[PDB]
Amino acid sequence: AGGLSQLVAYGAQDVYLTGNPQITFFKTVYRRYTNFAIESIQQTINGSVGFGNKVSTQISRNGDLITDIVVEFVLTKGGNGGTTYYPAEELLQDVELEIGGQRIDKHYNDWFRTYDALFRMNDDRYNYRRMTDWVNNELVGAQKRFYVPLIFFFNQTPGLALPLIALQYHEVKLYFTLASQVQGVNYNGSSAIAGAAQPTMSVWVDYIFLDTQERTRFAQLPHEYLIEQLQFTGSETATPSATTQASQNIRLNFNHPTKYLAWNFNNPTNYGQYTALANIPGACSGAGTAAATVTTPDYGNTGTYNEQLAVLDSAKIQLNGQDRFATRKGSYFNKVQPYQSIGGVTPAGVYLYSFALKPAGRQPSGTCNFSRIDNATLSLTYKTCSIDATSPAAVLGNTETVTANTATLLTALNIYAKNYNVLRIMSGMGGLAY
Amino acid sequence: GGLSQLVAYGAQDVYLTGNPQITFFKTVYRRYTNFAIESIQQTINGSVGFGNKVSTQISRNGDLITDIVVEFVLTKGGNGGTTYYPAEELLQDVELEIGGQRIDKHYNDWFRTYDALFRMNDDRYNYRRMTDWVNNELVGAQKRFYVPLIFFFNQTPGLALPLIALQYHEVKLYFTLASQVQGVNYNGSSAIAGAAQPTMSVWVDYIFLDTQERTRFAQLPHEYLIEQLQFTGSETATPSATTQASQNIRLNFNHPTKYLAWNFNNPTNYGQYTALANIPGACSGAGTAAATVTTPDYGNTGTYNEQLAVLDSAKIQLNGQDRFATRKGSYFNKVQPYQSIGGVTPAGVYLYSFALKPAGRQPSGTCNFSRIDNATLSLTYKTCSIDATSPAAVLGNTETVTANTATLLTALNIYAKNYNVLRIMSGMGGLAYA
Amino acid sequence: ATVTTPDYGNTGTYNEQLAVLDSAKIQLNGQDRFATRKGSYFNKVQPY
Amino acid sequence: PSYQIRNSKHHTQLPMRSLNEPPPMVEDLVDESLFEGLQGYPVDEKLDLLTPPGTATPSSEWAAINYGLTN
Amino acid sequence: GYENSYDANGARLVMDGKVVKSECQLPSYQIRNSKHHTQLPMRSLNEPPPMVEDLVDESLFEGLQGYPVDEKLDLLTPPGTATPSSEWAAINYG
Q: What angle is formed at CA B179 by the lines to CA B173 and CA B185, rounded to 5 degrees?
């Protein structure tokens, strides 16, 4: 009896699982590694910090390798809870990564929002929001320090740490553009907030200190790193209407072995708004009551999973005009793609098509080398904007091919592509292979 | 700084960093066989509708197949709160046939049980978004649902089914659509006049291999260690107001079993694994004057409130011998999945693993029932003495009792997931073991 | 004039206005063979 | 094709020893099918990144992801 | 003009759009060394035997399809012992 009664019952079908065993589970061998220490060091920010300003930092040669970078911001609330949406993320309009005077990559506030919406999840996503927004019903005048992590390839894993020790002659810089306006911080919609504070900013880089044998190795040897880059273009949306399903042939001006494409439609007025406004709870400012308006979002609840308010009916990718895959509905890109490839939940208005088995990983797992595709396109069909956004019966009780009349406000289209390149370092200098 | 940590080096560091084996500051990559993935629609033979049996056949467009998603278009036959995972309920079952052989079969209830045990966090939520209405949709609303299949080749690239090597065998899927789906074409026992029939389509993700991999598949024999689901329904030894019923259920299973899973349910209400009660979410109208404990709040059918679960305790016997000490139902509901999965299992759903990590593909301990002449699941039920219409009676009850409405959970569903071998040779495939 | 009875000797016509088909495409194994074209494409261009 | 093309190696949820604990092989250091914590290149004597057979350097992976493999 | 291909008997086979060059491309080549159970073409040898009829046994049985139990009753593959490679039907085209 007991476990032994199972253990003893060894049959023919068990040979595939336990005969001539190769492994065990009851003793783990751990791998000895090199000595290293991690230190959080503040960098100098040059240029004046303020809304709309451009500032930058040169990462000092303090440690040997660098990874994680967090930009701190101190913001104040220009209104009550519900007026902001990831304001620290909105403030950091963009970040440029430069090595040796060469542009390596560039991220945008919208990318950070898209990336998060698509790749973070569960408590990671929540904890992230806690570092970029006010999530405990804070009130006007509240002050908070925000931490915005960067997501460049070297900011995600030690395996891709930049070898500053190997860059004897080259500097690594970050250029940061601060937004002219941040919702609920210095502007309430289009209205400036009198008395709003200017942001305080600080850039923190977590440095890796190596032991003598490995520091020397990095300093002397050439190093090649397989890295990620973000390609991005803004497009004008073929805005749909009450009487029609707009369609659009979008040229995908991308190059390199792209891991995946991602995109969203948005109202550029309101950061993070990827869906139409409506008088249903959480879909607009004052939604559900007499004061509701479908011209302004409940900023604190800007994101939603209610696909009815999204505008993509269907889409396909084509290479030189040939279908890459059969046409699928917008909900296929919004719900299934990330189910299959990421495992999280993607907000309405945010779409993914992966060319990779595991787009969130470091290891290549299938790519689309757009440098070989003379005319890659994205073909989008939009939903009909016929739903009276101010009437829940019309909003919540409708069909697949339609959306809110207010969905015509989503006039911007943002298409991103993540791809793989090589960063090379040799004899004190570096930059990209191509 | 970081240097102060590196210098703190001595005898206790030897087992961590002496003679380093790997460095965490350098990623190693593997050159993988080039491939591509394309989504191709399969057709459906038979008329699609409720209660109908339809089927597909997967064409040889690519070489290997993995993910399969069945799309359904459903309408709401009532308001929000009237449906519960209706696309999951609709797909009553799917049978996997290769060369005419039944390889496997999933059931709507299995999809619900599987989800209850193995999906989690935002994977689970995103899943719900693809099978239900989760944004308070109203009567007349229409959505496309995506119900991924969970056959062994639908879960990992590693088991991509070798259509390429099956020159003479077709791969078919038979899908049974439920005659009734709650909140779609029926409301409890009542039909919904005017309810629409579903639109259905089956999508298969095909893998395209390069010349070299393609050749190997065509010339080499193959074998795959795959999963199968065994399933039978049993009557519950229904407990009552004055007694703790008990039952010995023969476990008519064979093959190396990774785990058993089971639930108790009310056949009338899909996904109902618990008793109904006048506490919020536990019954239709729960918490108010209109509450009834004969019908669930369908949108909140599932719950983590064990007080409404029927099972008191259970043990598994092998050939009449105890396999483990009798444990409470709460042990199978909460601890088992804590230990083995890492998610949260709803009340009324139970798991017993024979495997260290049943959530993975890699076998990690099995009970081979092909070597157990008479396995039995021994269940003890709680006393059904609690008046479900009195919130206090439920919320303040004891470990050994449950709701009087728990006697409605007259069905028992026992599942066993096991490992078999799919052999492919001479253009044909089929299982190694009966 | 009776529009429920044809002029039998003139049953046929080249006026596509009276044709029923608006547009069409052919698919193979679930994928478009070609993009949807108007009925007049199939009627006039293909044979051209 | 004359190439020892191995099976797939996916991120498994359980650690496993390769039953060859006295001779520490180098092909199991980068095999993600057994380890679950972190991934690093195997360091040889004097902290030299020794690439095991089957795997490839980052430059070789870039060449295989951009230009293509062979036969 | 494929004078150098796999002649089945008198026909050249086609499996994946191209003519079968040699026996190594066929699926049967993977199980060519095992004594198969049945060979899929199933050429009958010398005619089948006729259907013997009588008016005594059919009238005495009054139907009741009395089936003989002393036949050979060719067994199947026991579930425990996998499926022998012999169970794969050879599709010897040539």
A: 120
Question: Is the Cβ–Cβ distance between B66 and B157 less than 8 Å?
Answer: yes
Cβ contact A387:A406 at 8 Å: no
Per-position b or e across A213-236, b if 16+ CB within 10 A of its CB: ebbebbbeeebbbbbbbbbbeebe
Quick check: helix, strand or coil at residue B201?
strand
Q: Is A323 on the interface with C (CB under 8 A)?
A: yes
Q: What is the largest CA-CA distance in chain B?
A: 79
- The shortest CB-CB distance from A225 to any of D18, D19, D58 is to D58
What is the β-pairing status of strands B91-98 and B171-177?
antiparallel
Contact in structure between A276 and A246 (CB atoms under 8 Å): no
Integer Cα distance of B140 and B131 in angstroms: 17
CB atoms within 10 A of CB B238: 19
Angle at A133 between CA A132 and CA A137, to 5 degrees: 155
How many other CB atoms are found less than 10 A from the CB of residue E72?
Answer: 5
Phi, psi of E6 (to 5 degrees): -90, 95
Any CB–CB contact under 8 A between C30 and chain B? yes
Cβ-based contacts under 8 A for chains B and D: 91
Measured CA to CA, the distance from residue A305 to residue A308 in angstroms comes to 9
Sort B119 into a burial class: Cβ within 10 Å, 0-12 / 13-18 / 19+.
buried
Q: Which residue has the tokens 């009851």?
A: A26
Residues composing chain C: 48
Cβ-contact A276, A396 below 8 angstroms = no
* Torsion angles phi and psi, residue B211, rounded to 5: -60, -45
Q: B355 vs A16, A412, B336, B362, B419, CA distance in Å?
A: 15, 51, 11, 10, 12
Interface membership of D69 toward B (CB under 8 Å): yes
Inter-residue contact B211 to B116 (CB < 8 Å): no
Residue of A346, A362, A396 with shortest CB distance to B141: A396
CB contacts < 8 A, A to B, total: 212
B56: Cα separation from own chain's centroid? 22
> What are phi and psi for residue A214, nearest 5 degrees?
-80, -35
Residue matched to tokens 């309430």: A188
Using DSSP's 3-state secondary structure scheme, residue A405 falls into helix
Structure tokens at A381: 């069909």
Q: What sign has the CA pseudo-torsion B361, B362, B367, B368?
A: positive
Given resolution (angstroms): 3.5
Q: Cα(A284)–Cα(A277) distance, rounded to whole angstroms? A: 5
CB A96 within 8 A of CB A103: yes
Q: Do B42 and C30 touch (CB under 8 A)?
A: yes
**Of A10, A13, A17, which to mutate for an interface test with E (greatest number of E Cβ within 10 Å)?**
A13
Q: What is the DSSP string of B28-43?
A: -EE-PPPEEEEEEEEP
Q: Which of B150, B52, B162, B58 is nearest to B105 (CA)?
A: B150
C-alpha pair distances (Å), B66 with each of B153, B154, B161, B285: 5, 5, 7, 43
Where do the DSSP E strands lie in B219-356? 222-235, 246-250, 256-265, 311-318, 321-322, 327-328, 349-353
Instruction: Name residues 3-32 of chain D within 8 A of A (Cβ).
Output: 14-19, 21, 24, 29
Angle at A420 (CA atoms; ends A414, A423), nearest 5 degrees: 120
- Cβ neighbors of A177 (< 8 A, separation 6 or more) are A54, A92, A93, A94, A95
- CA B389 – CA B387 distance, rounded (Å): 5
Rg (CA), chain D: 14
**Residue B72 CA to its chain's centroid (Å):** 19
DSSP letter (8 states) at residue B354: S
What's the token pair of residue A191?
Answer: 């209205």
* Chain C environment of B59 (Cβ under 8 Å): 29
